C-alpha cells in the first residue's frame with residue numbers, strides 16, 4: 001500500500017487567527033519537544049512504506065505528527081489552542097494503540113508526552 005496523503009496544513013475555507021496560547025504552543029511547547037532526542041520519529045507523518053508498517057494505516061485512521069502540527073501553527077491553521085493540544089494527544093494515542101507497550105517507540109512517546117503535559121500546564125491565560 002501507498003501512504004495516505006498527509007493531514008491538511010492549510011484550508012482556504014477555514015477561518016484563521018493567532019492567539020496568545022497558539023503563539024505559546026509554537027514558540028515554547030513545540031520548540032521544547034522538537035529538540036528532544038526522541039522527537040525524530042514524530043517530526044513527520046508516519047511513512048508506513050519506508051518503515052515497513054503495512055497495517056499502520058489499517059489500524060490508525062487519525063494519523064497526526066509534530067511536523068503537521070508545526071505547519072498548522074505556522075499557517076495559523078488552528079482557531080483554538082484546544083485543536084492543537086488535541087493533535088498532540090492524537091499523536092501520542094496513536095502510538096499507544098498501534099505498538100506493544102514495551103516497544104522503544106512507546107517508551108519514547110511516554111517521555112515526550114510527559115514533557116508535553118508539563119509544558120501545557122504552563123500555558124498562559126487566554
Ligand SMILES: COc1ccc2c(c1)N(CCCNC(=O)c1cccc3c1N[C@H](C)CC(=O)N3)CCC2
Pocket residue numbers: 040041042044046050051053094095098099105
Ligand atoms: C523518520 O524518518 C526516518 C527515515 C529513515 C530512517 C528512520 C526514520 N529511522 C528511525 C526509525 C524510527 N522508527 C519508527 O518511526 C517506527 C518504527 C516502527 C514502528 C513505529 C515507528 N514510529 C512511528 C511513530 C509509527 C509507530 O507508531 N511505530 C531509522 C532508519 C532510517
